[PDB]
Subunit: 264 residues, 2 copies
Amino acid sequence: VDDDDKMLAAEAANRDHVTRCVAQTGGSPDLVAHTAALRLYLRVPHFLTEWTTDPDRRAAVSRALALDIVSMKLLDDLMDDDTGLDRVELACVCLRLHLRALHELESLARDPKAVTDILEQDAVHLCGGQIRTKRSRATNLREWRAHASTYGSTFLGRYGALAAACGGEGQPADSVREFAEAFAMTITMADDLTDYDRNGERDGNLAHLMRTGAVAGQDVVDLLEELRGRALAAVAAPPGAPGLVPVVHLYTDDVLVRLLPRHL
Amino acid sequence: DDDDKMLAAEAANRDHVTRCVAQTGGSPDLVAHTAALRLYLRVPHFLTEWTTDPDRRAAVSRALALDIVSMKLLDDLMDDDTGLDRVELACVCLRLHLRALHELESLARDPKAVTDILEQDAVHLCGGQIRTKRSRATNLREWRAHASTYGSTFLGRYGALAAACGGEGQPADSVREFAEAFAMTITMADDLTDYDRNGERDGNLAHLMRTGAVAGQDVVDLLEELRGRALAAVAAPPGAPGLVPVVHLYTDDVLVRLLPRHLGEAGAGAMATVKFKYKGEEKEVDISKIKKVWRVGKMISFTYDEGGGKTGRGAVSEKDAPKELLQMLEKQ
């Protein structure tokens, strides 16, 4: 039973927890399926909980983070209003998953107050950040990274902070967050460079900027290596999460080898 | 001065909400939209009426305002018909809600109480709202079942939170029961108002009344049941007597101002009558056929239309005269 085996079981368990919840609260088959298709979003909680040694606690935190992450993702679908899904179901399922995540996370936290502390702390940065990202679309790498540091980094950083607050002891809180924020940006880039063709995304889209020449391929490679370095550093602080090293290399290399060539 | 306390609480909640919306990056339109939620901003004042300490009362009141408003923005987002920017709506909705959780948790009687209350009936609330839109109500029973979720349960949770966060002397079950009953009176008012203010039809109570699928007298009865439920909750010890005028105000407003707009010529349904004996015969006439009416001691004498230019006569003791007839007296 290796790490891949653990990751795969975690993702399946998170997916089932999510779909059961969506279905019981009235979600239609189409909305349940949409939810089951958020693969990386259902997997990411497993990485964030890599520092949790108790396996039962780890699976509990993982699935609770997955409920809220899916919830925020549905809220995002609701703001772009472009999935064809019923807005009433989206909004209602979004709320229901979120409230269940709050309840599950608070029951796991050493101090239940820490959950709302973390969620309130940089709420203005995250929400005001998402508004500006859509207002003024990015035109170069500086601007792209600035926006992504909110809806990507701060967004995952919070779940990183929640994993440490709900994960028992032996948890270097600042490092789990540091890992989440650097890792988030690597996958946010991956997403941009994938959703260019799969979503017809242009304005503010990193792949678009690379193709139009507003952004240099070497700078994207540089950013990816900076993020790889920051993530590796975060997982090496004590107690340490060595299992995350191959994961950081996997997602970074995938962007360098598969995704970048598609835009240069 | 309860009316002045109420006005100021609404203003203070308004201030707290709009600043929060503005600081998150909500535009002037969105700020105006939330400032316009007058009843939503005032309602937290009713829910916290049992809170003895004024500084806790004001803090709980504004925290409830934050989340009620946030849920109202989520609702504007599921209908997407406000002209507001969807990104601002979603992000301000989230930011307000998160601020409300932090504030309430800081005042709660127990660390898990807030999330326990939000989770306990989240499925009943969320699946209830889905079904309200999925299967439009077609009679009073169905309209009431749906309204008990997005209306009663919705405000009941905030009633429960007001008790959880309001220190000692809170009769939890009572605050919540006042909330659930009052929310339905208000939900009915909104349906009868938004029929014309929004062009709402499918599943709309006023539409069901105009269409004949719901009878006026049943609506009156539901309103009276809700009024009695809210008055009983508010009478439980230690009591919140200040809410008594409030309950009457909203129920009577629906009865007097809104209902008639959807019923027509006297929609009580019960056309009132006068029974009397005239020339050895039993008689009964509709107050509608009644022409002239005057008093002689404790007797009420009158004339009415019998059949064509035909004119009837009668007199009854005032003890046997229906309200309606007695009203014609003074109106004559």
